[PDB]
Amino acid sequence: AALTEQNVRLRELLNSAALVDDKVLVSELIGVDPNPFTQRIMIDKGENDGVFVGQPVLDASGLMGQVVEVMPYTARVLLLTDTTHSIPVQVNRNGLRAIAVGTGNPERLELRYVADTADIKEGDLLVSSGLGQRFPAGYPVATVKEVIHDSGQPFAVVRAVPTAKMNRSRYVLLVF
Amino acid sequence: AALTEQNVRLRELLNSAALVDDKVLVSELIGVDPNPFTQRIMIDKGENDGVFVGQPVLDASGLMGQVVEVMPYTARVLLLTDTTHSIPVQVNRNGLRAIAVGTGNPERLELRYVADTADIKEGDLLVSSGLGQRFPAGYPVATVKEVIHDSGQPFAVVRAVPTAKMNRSRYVLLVF
Amino acid sequence: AALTEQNVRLRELLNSAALVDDKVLVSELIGVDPNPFTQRIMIDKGENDGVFVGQPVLDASGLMGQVVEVMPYTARVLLLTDTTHSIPVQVNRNGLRAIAVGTGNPERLELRYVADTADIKEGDLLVSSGLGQRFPAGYPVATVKEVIHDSGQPFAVVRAVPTAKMNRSRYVLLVF
Amino acid sequence: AALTEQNVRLRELLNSAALVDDKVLVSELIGVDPNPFTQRIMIDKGENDGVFVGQPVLDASGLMGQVVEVMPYTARVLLLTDTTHSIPVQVNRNGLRAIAVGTGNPERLELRYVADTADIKEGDLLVSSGLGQRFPAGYPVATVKEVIHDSGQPFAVVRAVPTAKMNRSRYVLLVF
């Protein structure tokens, strides 16, 4: 049951193993807090494996977050969906720039600084822009779920859904 | 023209000078970045005046933010509306607890962790809860502007309007 | 003819000699370029009189500009209406903040960074805010002449008329 | 997703790679401030690449600005839309001369010194004139969006829209 599931997930990772242009360490999600909102997880790679603080973490469908602390053989990763996390993004098709902030909900981000009149709609893909010099650019982050316009305010309300699996992830990739 | 305006504002501060239960230093807003979104300001009090990092800052109508760096005679204050700022709050009437995050818009906060079914509505007052042990409790923070409910997601979307003046403030109070 | 005119203007200056809260040097406008758009003038005070680069210059009705270069007994002053000049201001009544830029026209300024929905109207007085730490705050700068709203853009177009006389000024005051 | 987008943008640059008459360095936009009004950006070329202070910067559709400071491998570029920036221009068809100033809005310039009666209309193309000896002449700058005439004042109000992408740009060209 674990050997099947692990194989399926591993294959998916091999199919998306060409999405990177560098060396990536295949680490597994191991320590997780029981509460289903704890937007921070642990990985089965650490210092011995060359993992460092700040390192980006992704899966076969999206950027997941960043390492925020390292142990000899394990490490802690803050997910994009944490209220404390922000990532610069852009709408894939047109290059419209924004900041995606965590909401504390496992399945939602919110985009900041999107003009109320901006060309953005449900289903548009957001990808990393790299503009904070933390993440490689071009990797999928989320898809727009909703736009809410607001009378008198400069910026629209934009809710999005991460493309990575967050809570339902198995194995994770660390970028060098 | 400055003597009139300054007097009006000062009076308002004297009328709300009984809202505190301790000693408060009356400081003025002095250095501000030209850009009208820079959610961070400076004050005309500093180290010489006993101002410290972390100190809460408010006006006659709301909590404004916190000191984040000190100079001999001036200081820098991060406002609640900054994307990096979060404050624990509660709905005044019923005690429903939430986290108010800055949106980067001068006139808006967003509440996190509010159950989709929660008893919250447009016009409800949010006040500090003190639960992060950073702010005194009971001081006005914002009023709910909008609730948006979301199918399948645990938490509602709540937008609120700070009660303090943020960008349109003159003088500020520092709590000891 | 010059003794009458000079007396009238001097009196007006004596009536507005209580608008300052410090020592002010009464200097006259002396060297001016023939072209009626040259938004830069000279004054009959200089180094010998303690005039310095950066010093604010005003008349009985408004801030006029700043000294930009000093000579033994004369000095050059850049006016607010020069395209290269900007001054932080605020709407007197409500404290709405903005940047007033010179237009190159002797009788016009333009305000930057005023929300399209902002509470501003024809006849509102703008005064210095001091927020650039160059000018004393509270001194009259201009009155709003026109608001033009713009579909899709965040900021309104605001044209204003300086309260100082610019080209039709006689004598000028330098603030210490 | 980044490889597609980057290819499209690169092609567009190859199609407009004949607009220059000299050697141009293809640099990418890398460091950008989160705030969506910060009219200043960074490029992934610098001193090592022969980039210098003052150097003009453009894209496939317009002049973008100028380098204002150089680092070993990166550089900072001030955009035309910054309130501090001015560029001499001319109406393409008739040669009517003007100064285009930044407004602080990402999508707007304003023309100075345009006679109220001047032959200028919505949709006219403005191009660099070279007359400040900073920019090559003939390169597209903006298109007129609006003319507002003003009773008693010599100069019309002219708002224009840059042809370059400013905030929505990917890669940039530096002119030698």
Author numbering:
A (entry chain C), B (entry chain D), C (entry chain B), D (entry chain A): 79 to 254
Which lines from the publication concern this structure?
MreC is a membrane-associated elongasome component that co-localizes with the cytoskeletal element MreB and regulates the activity of cell wall biosynthesis enzymes, in a process that may be dependent on MreC self-association. MreC is essential for shape maintenance in rod-shaped bacteria, and mreC knockout mutants are not viable.
Negative staining images of MreCPa lacking the TM region and the first 21 residues of its N-terminal helix (MreCPa(36-330)) revealed organized bundles that associated into tube-like structures, some measuring several hundred nanometers. Subsequent three-dimensional (3D) helical reconstruction of the MreCPa tubular assemblies showed that they are made of six sets of filaments consisting of two protofilaments organized in antiparallel fashion (green and cyan in Fig. 1e, f, 2a), with the core being formed by direct interactions between the ‘butterfly’ domains of laterally associated MreC subunits. The structure presents a 6-start helical arrangement with a 10.35 Å rise and 5.7145 (x2) MreCPa subunits per turn. The final 3D reconstruction exhibits a global resolution of 3.5 Å; the central ‘butterfly wings’ are the most stable part of the tube-like structure while the initial section of the N-terminal helix is poorly defined in the cryo-EM map. Fitting the refined crystallographic model of MreCPa(97-258) into the cryo-EM map confirmed that within each protofilament, monomers are ordered in a polar, head-to-tail fashion, with the β-sandwich folds contributing with complementing charged regions towards formation of the interface between two protofilaments. MreCPa-Region2 was unable to self-associate into any kind of protofilament or higher order oligomer as indicated both by the lack of fibrous structures in EM and the low s values in SV-AUC (3.3 s, fitted f/f0 = 1.6).
